[PDB]
Amino acid sequence: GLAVELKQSTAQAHEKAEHSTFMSDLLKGRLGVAEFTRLQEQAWLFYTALEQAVDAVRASGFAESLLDPALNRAEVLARDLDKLNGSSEWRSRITASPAVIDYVNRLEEIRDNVDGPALVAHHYVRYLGDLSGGQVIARMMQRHYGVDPEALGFYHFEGIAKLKVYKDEYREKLNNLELSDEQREHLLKEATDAFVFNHQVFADLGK
């Protein structure tokens, strides 16, 4: 089934992402709220772009039940970043890292091509990770850095009650998607590139 083949085909990359120097230092408590904030600011850039692609693919009629607007992160993230930074200053100050310029360009290509299979790959890499390892990250930021839970909206998924059921249902939606051989191959390849872009976001933050 597709959910299983996704998890399998990216499990090695996921292990490598765990061991990125930036993210490893962050989660062991060696950095601080400033570096978590730098990450969130890059993520607001790529989630803005991802959610434009989502919106395009949802409107085309592809994977509609999977692309639940409730998952949208960008506006919650911006509220988090208002709290973390103390003001709206960050909006004119932030710039995309080179890793983010590549990731955003790919998401804009998927948007304008309305490429349903490529979009579902990027949707799985980001949102199932947020829904799945996100508490771990939200707990670490609270424990090591004292980040207020109100600045971790991104991880809360307001509007979802039973989270484990939602995850189960998300993976059943992936399994039930109609895909040709060419579309499934393209989706799997894109999921590998999604992890590659994410890992390079951390590499660039660590510079």
Ligand code: HEM
């Ligand atoms: C490039 C960065 C990362 C991405 C894109 C990503 C993405 C994902 C995705 C898509 C899943 C769900 C897999 C599935 O059920 O099919 C997941 C699971 C999970 N992630 Fe991540 N993730 C990343 C980094 C991390 C890091 C640094 C941690 C360390 C806290 C972590 C902790 C977890 C955990 C604990 C799971 C449940 C499965 C497992 O242990 O491998 N993730 N992630």
